[PDB]
């Protein structure tokens, strides 16, 4: 299987940010599509990159916000957290198409455990 190790997780203030990271491990052929998934509700695409670097951003809203990038070493840098994106965030690989890329998640087939991003208003925020 491929294994999806992931990090960066944490509690920050609203306009703040946070960088995750997910490696994949085991991977033998095909070099996986990674995406990035969350879920505070159903689960919802964020953003996902393929095997040469190419992103695609589930809304131009999100992609204003956050970046996708590729070292099998992905990072999700957030910008400009609000409060409602608060959720678990969620690694995944896709290495039947060929290294390319959808944002659906029925396209992934390995997840990853999840990490959570928690993200407090001013008045509800403590160290």
């Known amino acids: 299987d491929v294994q999806l190790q992931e990090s960066g997780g944490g509690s920050v203030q609203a306009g703040g940010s946070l960088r995750l990271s997910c490696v994949a491990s085991?991977?033998?052929?095909?070099?996986?599509?990674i995406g990035w998934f969350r879920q505070a509700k159903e689960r919802e695409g964020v953003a996902v990159?393929?095997?040469?670097?190419?992103?695609?951003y589930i809304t131009d809203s999100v992609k204003g916000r956050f970046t996708i990038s590729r070292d099998d070493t992905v990072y999700l840098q957030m910008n400009s957290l609000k409060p409602e994106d608060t959720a678990t965030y969620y690694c995944?690989?896709?290495?039947?198409?060929?290294?390319?890329?959808?944002?659906?998640?029925?396209?992934?087939?390995?997840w990853g455990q999840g990490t959570q991003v928690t993200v407090s208003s001013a008045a509800a925020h403590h160290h």
């Open positions: 995944a690989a896709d290495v039947n198409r060929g290294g390319f890329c959808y944002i659906e998640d029925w396209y992934f087939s390995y």
């Open positions: 990159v393929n095997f040469r670097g190419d992103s695609t």
């Open positions: 085991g991977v033998t052929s095909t070099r996986p599509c």
